[PDB]
Amino acid sequence: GAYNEWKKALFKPADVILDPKTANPILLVSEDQRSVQRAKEPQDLPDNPERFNWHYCVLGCESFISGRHYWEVEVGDRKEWHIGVCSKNVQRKGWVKMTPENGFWTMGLTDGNKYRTLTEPRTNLKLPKPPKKVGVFLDYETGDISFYNAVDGSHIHTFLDVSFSEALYPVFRILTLEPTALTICP
């Protein structure tokens, strides 16, 4: 497909590893630092400044302040997940609604078959086929964050022309306890 043939011509492949210091203590980051799961109960970890202590989130180890970047995430048969980018300076302690105005540009799935963008208010997406693997694409200078079905190239959603002022991290959120993890592809 053109998607596979061109992605690297146009966007720099990000090698995203999950930063265990950022991860909500209810989350487990795998040893290879590419997959996240949820525990039944919050594990015993410090409340260091980088950790999300309320939202069930985890960040990439590296952020972006320019250029064009992409990574792919195997969502598989998970019933719930959200992925995207966020500002370095988001509120990590206590609640904030996950929205562009709070520095989060995400979308995902809930209740097995409801695809949404996490805008204010949420808006529903209509996807012909459920995706298994989702590509997340950032162009910092144009302001676009776009999501594609990584297996067939079809478009899922684009946040257009955001005027970014901070560094941006990949972000991943899982609310549910299910057999299937959320996994980054290298």
Closest to ligand H6P by CB, 98 or 184 = 98
> Does the protein bind ligand H6P through residue 185 (CB under 6 A)?
no
> Does the protein bind ligand H6P through residue 56 (CB under 6 A)?
yes
> Does the protein bind ligand H6P through residue 8 (CB under 6 A)?
no
For the stretch 116-132, what's the b/e string if a residue is b when 16 or more beta carbons lie within 10 angstroms of its beta carbon? Answer: bbbbeeeeeeeeeeebe
Please state the closest distance from residue 75 (CB atom) to ligand H6P, in A: 15
Q: Which amino acid is at 82?
A: H
Whether the CA torsion 165, 169, 170, 171 is positive or negative: it is: negative
> Does the protein bind ligand H6P through residue 167 (CB under 6 A)?
no
Write 50-53 long-range contacts (CB < 8 A, 24+). Answer: 50/19, 50/21, 50/22, 50/92, 51/21, 51/22, 51/23, 51/24, 51/25, 51/92, 52/22, 52/23, 52/24, 52/92, 53/24, 53/25, 53/92, 53/93, 53/94
Going by the DSSP 8-state scheme, the letter that residue 100 receives in this structure is G
Closest to ligand H6P by CB, 55 or 92 = 55
Closest to ligand H6P by CB, 31 or 94 = 94
> Does the protein bind ligand H6P through residue 59 (CB under 6 A)?
no
Count of residues near ligand H6P by CB under 6 A: 8
> Does the protein bind ligand H6P through residue 118 (CB under 6 A)?
yes
> Does the protein bind ligand H6P through residue 184 (CB under 6 A)?
no
> Does the protein bind ligand H6P through residue 98 (CB under 6 A)?
yes
Q: Which of 90, 173, 181, 182 binds ligand H6P (CB under 6 A)?
A: 173
Closest to ligand H6P by CB, 99 or 154 = 99
Query: What is the contact surface with ligand H6P in residues (CB under 6 A)?
Result: 55-56, 97-98, 118, 122, 173, 175
